[PDB]
């Protein structure tokens, strides 16, 4: 079987010197240098991979349209679906309870 | 003779602490207006391992009272603190596990950790895993408090000095044998270069005061004066007593 | 083991060329010339090494400016040009 060589001056098997082996139209077997695998965009609240957002190496996000980098919702490309739902319910109930703790202290400013 | 292992440490070339992997300095908040007069509320975001420390650290997020920005503090995690817990810090904070209170606001018998030696130094006493400080009593006329330290010493601190309610997490670590030398190697791999230790009696007289002889032996008393000089203080320095400790102290 | 086998592991230059004296005495890790003292303002020279002073002193290079002070001094440091005689 044909054997291959690195295509650059780096002779060491580092993370940035990964190669794949590809067969060319010349029937030869040559090394093609591959780039580092992208990591998934993750939720800032729960840490899970966000759905609907492309997985790219960071500079590549600048050269792609916005529909690939976001989701049509509040906090779209930043928080998860369940975490946005949980933020909304917590915001509503606590602020509703904020009225209760206020009115409960104005009724006791007349009877107590 | 030669410079002994005691003295080469002062230059601190290979004897500096290994701090690449450290997660931050464990400190209380800077004493500010909110802590001096009322209370401020923060939330525990992470409980993480700090290399070189037996105690886990907690990263707690507070809001900034003066500008729109979030401030992340690195506290020593007390046992029972959980992620998402609300931590209340200040003079008027309540006696709940994890809250940071001035010493005068805590009754006698309160178990507290990361106690300030001086008001606003952000923590000096009771910071290792399983350790804590017991509050012995108060002297309100002089604004002073008596506490018991992990060493068993009683200390008098300003009652305005702050501390964190509870015991430092991770206690009982010493209960397990290390077994292997490799376990100690990895323990000190992220602390400093202090392991392993060669016995001075096994070296030559140039290398150490205990070295030399046709048998391994110290030759003179290993209790060394407090007034001895550098290069002599190897052994039991200013030892009040020696031998097996029998009875109570 | 400490001789011929160990002498095979010499491929890391401790010194490289100096910009001041061009000698390859510039300690790479120390960033100093052991010969010329670069980047110190003064030149490295010792009175216990007089032969080193011989090797690098006034007159061992071109003296591209001190060459001509004697000839300009001898004429009293003239200003103007020589005038052709009638």
């Amino acid at each position: 079987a044909q054997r291959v060589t690195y295509r650059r001056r780096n002779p060491y098997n580092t993370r940035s010197n990964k190669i794949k082996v590809v067969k060319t139209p010349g029937g030869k077997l040559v090394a093609q240098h591959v780039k580092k695998a992208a990591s998934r965009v993750k939720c800032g609240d729960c840490g899970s991979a966000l759905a609907g957002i492309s997985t790219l190496r960071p500079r590549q996000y600048a050269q792609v349209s916005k529909t690939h980098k976001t989701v049509q919702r509040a906090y779209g490309g930043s928080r998860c679906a369940n975490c946005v739902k949980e933020r909304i319910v917590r915001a509503f109930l606590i602020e509703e309870q904020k009225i209760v703790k206020r009115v409960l202290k104005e009724q006791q400013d007349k009877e107590k | 003779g030669r410079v002994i292992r005691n003295q080469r440490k002062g230059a601190g070339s290979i004897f500096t602490s290994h701090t690449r992997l450290r997660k931050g300095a464990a400190k209380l908040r800077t004493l500010d207006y909110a802590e001096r007069h009322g209370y401020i509320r923060g939330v525990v975001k992470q409980i993480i391992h700090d290399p070189g420390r037996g105690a886990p650290l907690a990263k707690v997020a507070f809001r900034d009272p003066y500008k729109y920005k979030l401030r992340e503090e690195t506290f020593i995690a007390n046992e029972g603190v959980y992620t998402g817990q609300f931590i209340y810090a200040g003079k008027k904070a309540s006696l709940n596990v994890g809250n940071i209170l001035p010493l005068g606001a805590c009754p006698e018998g309160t178990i507290v950790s990361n106690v300030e030696e001086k008001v606003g130094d952000r923590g000096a006493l009771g910071r290792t895993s399983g350790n804590y400080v017991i509050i012995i009593g108060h002297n309100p006329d002089e604004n002073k408090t008596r506490v018991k330290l992990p060493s068993g010493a009683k200390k008098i601190i300003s009652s305005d000095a702050r501390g964190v309610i509870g015991v430092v997490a991770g206690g009982g670590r010493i209960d397990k044998p290390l077994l292997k030398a490799g376990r100690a190697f990895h323990k000190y791999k992220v602390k400093r270069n202090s392991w392993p230790k060669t016995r001075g009696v096994a070296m030559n007289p140039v290398d150490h005061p205990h070295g030399g002889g046709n048998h391994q032996h110290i030759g003179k008393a290993s209790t060394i004066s407090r007034g001895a000089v550098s290069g002599q203080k190897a052994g039991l320095i200013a030892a009040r007593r020696t031998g097996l400790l029998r009875g109570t102290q | 083991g400490k001789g011929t086998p160990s002498l095979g592991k010499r491929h890391n230059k401790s010194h490289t060329l100096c910009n001041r004296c061009g000698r390859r005495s510039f300690h790479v890790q120390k960033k100093t010339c052991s010969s010329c003292g670069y980047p110190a303002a003064k030149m490295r020279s010792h009175n216990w090494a007089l032969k080193a002073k011989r090797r690098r002193t006034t007159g061992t290079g071109r003296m591209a400016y001190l060459k001509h002070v004697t000839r300009r001094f001898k004429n009293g440091f003239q200003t103007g040009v020589a005038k052709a005689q009638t």
């Binding site: 001056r9 | - | 490289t16 060329l17 390859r24």
Partner: protein, 50 residues
């Protein structure tokens, strides 16, 4: 090495140019005393100083 600095490559250029034999018309000058270039250098024999 293949990866070399400009400062290195310029010194190697001078070393090649200094590694010429004596031009032969120089021996014909009057009162000429140089018979050969006495500052010849082989790469394997004597190493430079870089």
């Amino acid at each position: 090495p293949s990866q070399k600095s400009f400062r290195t490559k310029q010194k190697l250029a001078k070393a090649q140019k200094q590694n010429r034999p004596l031009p032969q018309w120089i021996r014909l000058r009057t009162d000429n005393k140089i018979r050969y270039n006495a500052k010849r250098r082989h790469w394997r024999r004597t190493k430079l100083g870089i």
